[PDB]
Chain A
Amino acid sequence: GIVIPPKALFTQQGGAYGRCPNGTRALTVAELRGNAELQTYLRQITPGWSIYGLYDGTYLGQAYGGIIKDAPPGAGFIYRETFCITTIYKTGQPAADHYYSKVTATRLLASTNSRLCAVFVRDGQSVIGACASPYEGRYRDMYDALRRLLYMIYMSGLAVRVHVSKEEQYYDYEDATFQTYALTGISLCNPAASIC
């Protein structure tokens, strides 16, 4: 099952013609579908007979009855108002260390002035996603070091123990079955040294 962007990430003055401002990303219908409160919120803020673009489908103002109609990626961008969510969310959980072993890095992703991310996968399953931005975040200064090793391990098929702080959550990948947090450390596996 997918992960649902919390209502609070809903960019009030959403993007325009599919160009969500930097740091924000087009809400998907799969997402809007599963978020009851956001739908609920939408029915109140939406003026009559207005249509809204989404990455997937479209949203028809309460006049049309509040309809989430599907459509191809980027099709609803024809319309001026696009629903966008802010990619970063402050969980509130403590900044403790959490890590996963035997994972590989895949699925790069980069917005403009935002994070570079990767999906860590163990034997097929997407285990967790990690992001790093030099532009913002608790660990904005460690970006330059991390991206370099992020890169090496992605180019090589090297297993890794990844560290992540659930301090802040990231909603960059749309319709993800996995959670994405802040990258804080990478450690190539070393079984014979108690690493993986």
Chain B
Amino acid sequence: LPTHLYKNFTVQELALKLKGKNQEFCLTAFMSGRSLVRACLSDAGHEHDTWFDTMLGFAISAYALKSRIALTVEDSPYPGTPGDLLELQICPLNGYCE
């Protein structure tokens, strides 16, 4: 589970789509000096995961507030593919995550 953390990144793309027949949302975190950090949270099939809706709303707020976020993605065994988002943090408004 090669997890990673990215602080003081901005949400640039937000998208709710369908992967085959499973719900799926993704965001692209971007920082000027670099590449795009894409992570997706997929509807694990198990209907109970309020997680999906909660993280989705939280990610929408982060997108809405235009705040720098600090995000933790795990990794996908095939490059050029968004990894799974496991935690999201909204940095102090108007500032930076320390």
> Is chain B in direct contact with chain A in the complex (CB below 8 A)?
no
